[PDB]
Amino acid sequence: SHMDDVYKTQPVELFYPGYLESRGYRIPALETTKKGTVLASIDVRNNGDHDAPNNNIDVGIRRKEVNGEWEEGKVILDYPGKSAAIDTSLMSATIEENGIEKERIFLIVTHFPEGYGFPNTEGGSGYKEIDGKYYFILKDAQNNEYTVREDGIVYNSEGNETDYVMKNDKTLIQNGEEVGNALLSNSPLKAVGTAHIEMIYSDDDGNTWSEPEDLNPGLKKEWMKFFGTAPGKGIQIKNGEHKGRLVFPIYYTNQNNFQSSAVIYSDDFGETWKLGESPIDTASVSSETVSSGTQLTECQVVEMPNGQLKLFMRNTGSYTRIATSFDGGATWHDEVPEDTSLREPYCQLSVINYSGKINGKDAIIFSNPDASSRVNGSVKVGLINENGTYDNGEPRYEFDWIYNKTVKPGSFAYSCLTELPDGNLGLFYEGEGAGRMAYTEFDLNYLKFNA
Ligand SMILES: CC(=O)N[C@H]1[C@H]([C@H](O)[C@H](O)COC(C)=O)O[C@@](O)(C(=O)O)C[C@@H]1O
């Protein structure tokens, strides 16, 4: 029996094999809207649990409105064939329009054409810059280059018009008929086999979503191979000099296949994006050229009281790495320590801000498999203490890990926390077995309890 003042719901399954005709599901993401709706998005991995390639993977989402029930799941982003959309990240953000606070929900996801995934991705942005404009590259089977331009007219490398058009959905039209799709590995002209980040947004509290916008052009560097969403959530900076900025954690690989964490950020409410440096970038080390040492991969971000950023990162070492940014994620302090409270078995993790005070301190919630392996799902509570400053004027925040509660003793993999309107926490996690994506709720007391 749990203690008298404790809240913990028996886990339910929000996605499972067969649901929406999908054989497989992975990669939980969970965000709460300002209207108090919980969004749970997921990889609808149609052909099984395996990553890209050789998987028809789409984006699925479920909504639960405040004092409502889990509504039915929808596929909200679908690509031709076995082209994959993999690893989603949700972010609820607001903009003061008139004097009305308007809310937009952003989702980003990594996207690959048929035949491609992390293990075999090619390099590049997928675009050619010609006189300031970015143009979508197509390749023929003899590896010549074409670009997509005005009205989807396909130009060749000599710079002249072909008899091909590409529609937005990557459909290829030649002399009236549809002759293929640029994302399908059997198309006469193909997109570059490389990672993209695509974004969709929702203006109606998750009910409906935009068409995908490729974020690659002008953002992903030509030297990057993998370039991808760090699944979980993004955040909008609440306070400090960079209030209002959108912050989406990502990671990428260089020409040596070395993995570096970073964030992409927007100061114009998602209109344009910029790439921050990796915590891997110092004056000693460049994430472009690095080829040895601790890799920093998937990551999630929290904001300290004055707006300073903390990026928690899956990595090749034994414990979680934390990076600090003083400039809204543009750059990180040179020093990137482990937290030896946060054992890191090489798995995605979730970290979030908590809106209320806990023992009169501000707090974050963390979850991951606390073990050498993907077992022992544990949710921790971290109290934030100031303890000094930096040569540079800004406070030096440290983590007190007061609660550390096992919520799943056996298998536990990817998870994502969210704060509920009522002040409780949701957790959307892998590990219930058999492709089943589990959602549970609990309160702070649940976390205080010692087994
Ligand atoms: C493939 C992808 O885009 N993302 C996947 C990620 C990723 O391949 C990893 O971060 C890179 O490092 C490795 C492969 O060693 O790893 C997972 O395969 C896993 O479960 O670990 C699931 C996740 O969807």
Author numbering: 354 to 804
Structure paper excerpt:
The positions of the active site residues in the NanJGH33 Neu5,9Ac2 complex remained essentially identical to those in the NanJGH33 Neu5Ac complex, continuing to suggest a relatively rigid active site. The 9-O-Ac group was accommodated by this group being orientated up and away from the active site, rather than continuing the trajectory of the glycerol chain into the a 9-O-Ac binding pocket as in NanHGH33. In NanIGH33 and NanJGH33, the 9-O-Ac binding site is apparently blocked off by phenylalanine residues (F353 and F471 in NanIGH33 and NanJGH33, respectively). The presence of the 9-O-Ac group, however, and how it is positioned in the NanJGH33 active site appears to change the context of other acetyl groups. The conformation of the 9-O-Ac group in the NanJGH33 complex would be anticipated to clash with the conformation of a 7-O-Ac group if positioned in a manner that would allow accommodation in the NanJGH33 active site. NanJGH33 was more efficient than NanIGH33 at hydrolyzing Neu5Gc and could accommodate 7-O-Ac modification, but the latter only when 9-O-acetylation was absent.
Here, we present the structural and biochemical characterization of the GH33 catalytic domains of the three sialidases of C. perfringens and probe their substrate specificity. The catalytically active domains, which we refer to as NanHGH33, NanJGH33, and NanIGH33, displayed differential activity on various naturally occurring forms of sialic acid. We report the X-ray crystal structures of these domains in complex with relevant sialic acid variants revealing the molecular basis of how each catalytic domain accommodates different sialic acids.
